[PDB]
Nucleic acid binder design. Sequence first.
RNA 1: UCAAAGAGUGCU
Lengths: 50, 27, 52, 269, 34, 51, 221, 49, 101, 28
Amino acid sequence: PGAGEANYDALELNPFETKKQRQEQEVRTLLNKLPADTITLDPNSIGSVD
Amino acid sequence: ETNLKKLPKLETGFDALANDWFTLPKP
Amino acid sequence: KGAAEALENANDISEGLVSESLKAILDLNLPKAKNITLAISDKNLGPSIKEE
Amino acid sequence: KTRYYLEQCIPEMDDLVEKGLFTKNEVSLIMKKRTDFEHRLNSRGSSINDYIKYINYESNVNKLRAKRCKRILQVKKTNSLSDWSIQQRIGFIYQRGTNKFPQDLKFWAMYLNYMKARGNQTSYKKIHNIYNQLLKLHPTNVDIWISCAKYEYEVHANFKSCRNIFQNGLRFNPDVPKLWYEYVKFELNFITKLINRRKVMGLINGDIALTIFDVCMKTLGKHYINKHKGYYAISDSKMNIELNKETLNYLFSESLRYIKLFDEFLDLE
Amino acid sequence: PPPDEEEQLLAKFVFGDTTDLQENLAKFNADFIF
Amino acid sequence: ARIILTMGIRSKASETDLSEILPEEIEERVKTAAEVSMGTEITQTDLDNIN
Amino acid sequence: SSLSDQLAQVASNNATVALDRKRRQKLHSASLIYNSKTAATQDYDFIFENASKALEELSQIEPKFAIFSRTLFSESSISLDRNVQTKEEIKDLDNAINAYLLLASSKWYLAPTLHATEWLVRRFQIHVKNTEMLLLSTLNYYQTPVFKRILSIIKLPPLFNCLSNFVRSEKPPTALTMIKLFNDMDFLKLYTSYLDQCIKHNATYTNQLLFTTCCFINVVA
Amino acid sequence: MKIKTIKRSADDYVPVKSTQESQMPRNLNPELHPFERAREYTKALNATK
Amino acid sequence: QYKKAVSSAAATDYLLPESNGYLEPENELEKTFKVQQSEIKSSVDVSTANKALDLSLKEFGPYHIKYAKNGTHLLITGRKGHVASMDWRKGQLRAELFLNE
Amino acid sequence: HASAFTRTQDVPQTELQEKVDQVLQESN
RNA sequence: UCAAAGAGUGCU
């Protein structure tokens, strides 16, 4: 008891994802691919003003 | 007052309602 | 109401005339109101509507 | 946009939990049933029974809140969003269902009755707005013209506008004999109450119907000639006689029906 | 004070309680139905 | 043919009862067809021989 | 055991879970009144409404049907799912279903029984879980169209493999194929228990006995 | 003793109707949606293109 | 707007349909470590008992288990080289690899 | 907005109306 | 049958 998360966000991941949306999710996440050089020690640091 | 009750009330039903030709033969 | 009304209105629509049915339906809908604007396919029907 | 509807209700459950009426567990159950309906109503193949089911389910939630208010808070009304929100939202669902399915006269009927019962909460102007759309969508249904005429001659007793509703209805439906009968019946009702008031006035100190009779024959005859003849006139001289006879037979039964109306009114001569 | 039967009946409908059904199950005996 | 005996003209079709002739679902079709019908009016001189 | 064999047991255990849209279509499409397309469109509430009326007609013919209105054909049964119930409750649910099949034993010729059973098929999926009890009870309604509809929507158990020919078939099962079913030793004693239940309950009726008598008499020949 | 486990109602998440829209559960827990700052930027850059 | 935005986040926290599990003892004598796994198998419903999976196979032991993010599909790889991809809920194997590496 | 309740025509459109208001005018 | 891939139809 308590091992898993109580509630899951549909947009991020869905156990009930049908065959056609998992493709819809796949292409979108490709479109939203994060560059390798975007990696940082803190996600909040990125985008500051120099 | 008794007469006023005898007078008719307009009756309405909505409240009651509330409660192929072109195909040739194959040889 | 029936077949007869459609023909006599069909006669009236063609001659750019306003039937009692057209006068009846329009009155309940278009506000008295600056001037309310109504779209009609017929230019000839326009003057008839304006008169009424 | 199901989430938008779900989010509009958040302040209310928070109010339910804050007041202590409903536990977070019970509140979650109400939410889950609410969520299923909203997706149902917004989806494809949605029907009116979905609106009725949601309205019936939501009505029950209001009753439990009222019972729990006296049981737990021991208050008739707690001054917070909870009191008027379930009642407000039900009207919203009626608007959507009536908007979504204008055809069903049955669904419109509960909407008028539901708002009529909560007379204090819903102004008579809101009942007016519902009728104006309803008469506008279904102008040829006599029952609705007599509907709003009956509502306000009894609840509001405005004979001038009650005359107006019939005055409009007869314009669209001059061939239905039922509508003429009610507008005559209303007319003699107005006269009798006026005369009875005059009698009461003395104690503390009609032709107009017959005119409605006159034209009522003429147009009913005209329309009955228009029907049974179809698009065109009848060439044979004999049939035109039966056409006249049929109107006379149809017309007399219309007149005889009114002779029975006169008997009901004792005061009138 | 404990709720009245009328209040109890309304409680089951709103909360969707299925216990009442469950003992009515757990108390069936096939002999009685036949 | 039995329909023509009961109703001579489409105007009669609207009120004439076809229960003994046709089932409920069919008999209403002819009534609806009658008012949206296509044929022209026929004389009683004509109607007599058709009967 | 092979992983595929172990995996097959998992599928059988979760046959009714309805993980996705595609499985739910197969479960809900199964129907005894309507075709697959119309069946998918129908609602539990709509199905329950017809079933409740059907049970009342059955109640008039025999009062004992009225008991299930309190248990199986209740309004709360709409919200009852078996997948969410525990072991004790499922055993508790199954027996109540079994008695209903027994009381319906002499009445499938009556149309309302077919409507009433639809709720159990749609809500409780008796065709998937209580597949033996449903099919044992309808053995002597074989030539009736109802039995053919049962075969289409039902996965035949191992003991009824001989009927796999007539599933979704124009011709109904012949009388000769039956002897083969009862000729099987494992079936007779399976059939013995069900008959043993009816005699205890006095639920046996003529058409059960007369169908029952011939086949065993035929197995001898 | 008292046990409760994460329990999914199949009817809630998989509609009985073929035409009814499946429920999309949503949780705005910030941890469940990582890389805000990289994400919005990528949606920004795609928009300019 | 942040105090408004977090308020909206607090608003959606109510929307979340279900909660996590618990396991606390009724009696202080009862201990969460004392409870044995079979007893929990009894408490959980039938579907959860099916959701629990146990398969014994020794051909390519040991086997490393990996779990998909969405979690529909299990990937288990044997030490001697056997890997099978399958969905535990559905009960269908996606692909079978018998490579002896 | 146009409503069946209040007359926006300002004159009697139907022959009924020309007649009824005459009685209303004649009465008082 | 499942299972992966296309191409049209209805409708929010």
